[PDB]
Design a protein around this ligand. Structure first.
Ligand code: CTP
Ligand code: MN
Ligand code: MN
Length: 444
């Protein structure tokens, strides 16, 4: 790991330690997916472990106008996670100290004298694969509290930064979490919610690593297990030793990445492994139930574990229904991308997730960039997802959605493999065409 990035994290640590000293309340601004919430939890946790105080604002998206409304307000430290690198200039205007812990492409702008900017892109590192907002927040606070390291990896998995291994900075965090004693790693089937779902349901809800034929299909997962002689209504731990062996070898046929590293932390037993945690935060994020999600990151797991578990159930059921909708009505294919459109409010905040999973399952052609579109009154919210070989051939979704969205005065961005945008509904056809041309240019 580059020395410079630990050094920059130390500098954020120091600025954070100072504003706590003077008693005053830290302002935490973050995103609403697993990375954003876990990133916000890394920080809240650090600040709690020194009896400090914080106000959280969670956002779907950061705009120039929120930053101006941040511009009034009298707080002396603003801590941005998973956002803000792209608005460095506007953020620089704030009169008060700022920390930005992000893993998106920075705008080209002079970072303020009161701004400490921690971002893998600034240190030769890769923000798409090797470090997320949660890891960056960890690096910012590691020298105050090492116990948040598992949270950091939850955010990495939220952002799909596990491909048969943590890599880069995330590997570094994993190792440091293991020597702290707060993370354990062992080999096993990487099923969803192994301690709280019966096996057929655990299989149905294993979206990553994906299980073609089984994932999203309760009937098929049930019949599958009967076919191979493995009990379907028992939880995975409760199976016989011989049923475990049969199931490894049979699921490994379907996808070999299903057997691998499982990440546990004693603080999260009774909820599940690290990917399960990330699952829970996404369900919390999608239902606008921040506080329960953030609360889970601090330890507030009383009757509220049970509330999160049941948000998760309904989210996973909307994801199942989501996927069947894609199998039913497939995509609409242009030259260089394909898209999927909805006004069903039920697919409100999951369009991005169901696109990613449809591609891993290869229900939609994984080599053709996919844009999911949710109507929002007079606007349309775009969630673009592709795969690594498409990125290797030149696709960059963050670049293409920013530039296409900006032709309509709109906002877009993200990373190479996944991005967002907001455009007027009236401009959908024209936006999609423009995105189609740019992706053509990027691959030609
Ligand atoms: N390498 C990545 C990073 C992000 N995402 C998806 O893109 C979404 C937005 O990520 P953000 O970092 O906020 O931009 C995430 O919730 C995640 O599901 C992904 O598929 N692959
Ligand atoms: Mn992120
Ligand atoms: Mn995010």
């Amino acid at each position: 790991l580059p020395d410079s990035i630990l050094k920059r994290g130390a500098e954020a640590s120091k600025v954070l330690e100072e504003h706590l000293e003077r008693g005053n309340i830290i302002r935490i601004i973050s995103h609403n997916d697993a990375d954003g919430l876990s990133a916000a939890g890394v920080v809240a946790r650090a600040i709690s472990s020194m009896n400090g105080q914080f106000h959280i604002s969670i956002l779907s998206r950061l705009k120039k106008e929120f930053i101006k409304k941040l511009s009034g307000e009298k707080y002396s430290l603003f801590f941005f996670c998973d956002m803000g690198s792209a608005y460095l200039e506007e953020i620089s205007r704030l009169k008060g100290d700022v920390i930005v812990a992000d893993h998106h492409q920075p705008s080209e702008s002079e970072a303020g004298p009161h701004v400490v900017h921690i971002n893998p892109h600034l240190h030769g590192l890769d923000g798409s694969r090797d470090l997320s907002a949660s890891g960056t927040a960890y690096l910012a606070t590691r020298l105050l509290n090492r116990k948040t390291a598992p949270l950091a990896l939850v955010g990495a998995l939220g952002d799909m930064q596990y491909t048969d291994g943590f890599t880069g900075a995330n590997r570094f965090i994993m190792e440091e979490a293991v020597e702290e004693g707060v993370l354990q790693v062992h080999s096993d089937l990487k099923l969803a919610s192994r301690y709280t779902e019966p096996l057929y349901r655990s299989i149905a809800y294993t979206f990553n690593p994906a299980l073609p034929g089984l994932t999203g299909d309760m009937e098929a997962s049930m019949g599958f297990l009967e076919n191979i002689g493995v009990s379907y209504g028992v939880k995975y731990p409760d199976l016989s030793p011989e049923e475990r062996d049969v199931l490894r070898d049979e699921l490994t046929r379907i996808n070999p990445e299903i057997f691998g590293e499982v990440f546990t932390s004693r603080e999260f037993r009774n909820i599940g492994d690290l990917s399960d945690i990330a699952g829970v935060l996404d369900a919390c994020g999608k239902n606008r139930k921040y506080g329960i999600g953030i609360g889970l990151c601090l330890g507030e797991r009383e009757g509220a574990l049970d509330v999160a578990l049941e948000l998760q159930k309904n989210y996973r059921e909307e994801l199942v229904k989501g996927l069947a909708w894609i199998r039913r009505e497939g995509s609409t294919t242009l030259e260089n991308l394909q898209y999927i459109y909805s006004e069903d409010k039920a697919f409100k905040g999951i369009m991005g997730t169901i696109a990613s999973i449809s591609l891993s399952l290869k229900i939609l052609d994984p080599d053709i960039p996919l844009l999911g579109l949710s109507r929002m009154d007079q606007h349309v919210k775009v969630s673009a997802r592709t795969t690594r070989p498409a990125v290797e051939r030149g696709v960059n979704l963050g670049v293409a959605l920013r530039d296409a969205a900006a032709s309509f005065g709109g906002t877009g961005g993200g990373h190479d493999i996944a991005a967002g945008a907001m455009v007027p509904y009236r401009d959908m056809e024209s936006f999609l065409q423009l995105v189609d041309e740019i992706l053509g240019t990027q691959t030609g």
